[PDB]
Amino acid sequence: FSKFVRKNPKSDKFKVKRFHHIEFWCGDATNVARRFSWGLGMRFSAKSDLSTGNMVHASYLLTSGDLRFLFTAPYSPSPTTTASIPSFDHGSCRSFFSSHGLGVRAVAIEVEDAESAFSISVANGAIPSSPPIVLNEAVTIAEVKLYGDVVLRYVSFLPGFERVEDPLDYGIRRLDHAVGNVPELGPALTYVAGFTGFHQFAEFTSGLNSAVLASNDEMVLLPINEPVKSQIQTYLEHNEGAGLQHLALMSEDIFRTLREMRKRSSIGGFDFMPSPPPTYYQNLKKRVGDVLSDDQIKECEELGILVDRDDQGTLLQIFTKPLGDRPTIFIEIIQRVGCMMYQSGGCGGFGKGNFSELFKSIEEYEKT
Amino acid sequence: SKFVRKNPKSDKFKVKRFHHIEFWCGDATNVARRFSWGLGMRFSAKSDLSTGNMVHASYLLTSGDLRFLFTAPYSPSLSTTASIPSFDHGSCRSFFSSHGLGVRAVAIEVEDAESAFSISVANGAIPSSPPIVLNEAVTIAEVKLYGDVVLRYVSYKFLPGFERVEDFPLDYGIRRLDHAVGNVPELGPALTYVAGFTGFHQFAEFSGLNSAVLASNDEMVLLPINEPKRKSQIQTYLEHNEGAGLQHLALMSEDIFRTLREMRKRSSIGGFDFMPSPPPTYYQNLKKRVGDVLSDDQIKECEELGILVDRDDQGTLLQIFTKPLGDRPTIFIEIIQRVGCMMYQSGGCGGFGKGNFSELFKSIEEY
Ligand SMILES: O=C(O)[C@@H](O)Cc1ccc(O)cc1
Ligand SMILES: [Fe+3]
């Protein structure tokens, strides 16, 4: 008596593969990358600083599976020849951090040819941010504006980077989707999907309007939020315009990651949102009992994990507190169940039907 | 044969001890949460949006009597609510844009800050912030020290506007700040300047740099200053810091082996890294110059943890240095434990490590 029909026109104007990395623009990349490495459990993989000859910026790379988190901070200007990332600008980086604080600068995706995906994007309305530049005849990097001061980066770690050698792993394996807030969803949705050809990923159905753009294989998901009390309007005010709201980090085992990330919340890691009331986890039997066992439900309660369902699969998720000083960007840890055939992207939705379940649990909790 | 140390006790105002150190950051949350894990300091007070402050976010880390403050500016679009009246968004942004992560204020507790500020300015000090009484309880004044670092005065002893943080806690053994060392291009002018308005006397000592230690009457507030074989790290400091600034802080510890076992264990998982260890010959000779102080097992612990041991006419100093704290090879941290001079412990017991360069060079050529 219910069926959800999802369509996929596969209208990608250029060949998009997978997410490549995320580049946080910092004021001091060392302390940001070392805190992220201890909280998320990511390994110090590569570096491009003074110890590698880079006299322009200190970029450090953290990895946990297919996830790459880059942390870039500008050196004192006292010619960016030794710079490994040619799109980096000292004036831009200082202005970005003074206007937005700690946050994501680049959302990088791997493409077949960055030079073509750049020209096709601009030919379809994309604002150019960095022209196609070939790195040592091996890698090509191009950047166009996504929203606000965040850029969409095309890659087809990097030259100039040196590997770091000499266990830090909590279960995070890849980046699922990067969500950004904009003042008006409409113009931002037609703009981004207007130069990538990304189709809308429908969700099965609070102060927000969300729409999910996705590539053909739907592994590159880009939800965008708009404020309708609203958490988004507070984000726009504190971030001084449109920016990335949160990053969803796929975990091989969300229970492993959550126990690893909660032991360290008070000793350098990350803090989480208030856990759902107990009646929320007394209602999981009549919701995902056929997916999660009774003991795995006890794990979600002890770890404060949100569990939502969809037409295809089940989504286990939780959110952290803001990563920096500003109540702006935070991190989402998810684990998707089902759609195995390789797992389909967006399996289980994103959590649209979770505000209704939290409202129902809070109204239930009370009165008891 | 005999070393003679003199103390004129010429403090132009009553000074007690170090109060706190305020780092100016780009993001105070990630820097403090990194410092809290590497050094083992407790989240004690906060002055951010959760307290009503829409101007900046200040977080205090404590370890015994040591207090590290971490201040980062909010966006001016939030528009009075600042608990630290000397804070300026443009100054904090321009400071960090010029020097990066570093020390802004070296706060010392005095008897009266309205006097410490006026007497200082009347004796050559460059004023940074006039005396401001906070909620009729705390008075804060600031005068320039060297570079963009300010010497902050705290009168009646975290601060009004801060909320205590509750919630076993972290503690690696660090208990107090020993001395705050700064690098300047010319030691001479900066010496007659700082001592010109403080009256701090020169602390006598028992490389590429020249050092001079200014100290208060009881010699608990120590402020060594450095000036620029191979090229000295002082000149490399001035280039990457864009002028004079604080070089390092010496964090005294009840047990340097406890603190180092905690700090080295976490160097690769978010903590702080240390300088390369001395060769084994340095610790084979560590029982001929310091054997009446350290036992055989305690000498073995220094070799395992890479600690340097120096000695002077009064006491013995066990010390070790960390790698630079941020992206720039500028600010770093020293862990110190002093033995001897017990009569309460005298300030500067064992010196500051001026003789370690000679014993290290003697140890490298022995290996
Ligand atoms: O990225 C997104 O749009 C979703 O992650 C948002 C979301 C997810 C779960 C939830 O309970 C509320 C909002
Ligand atoms: Fe999400």
Ligand SMILES: [Fe+3]
């Ligand atoms: Fe020292």
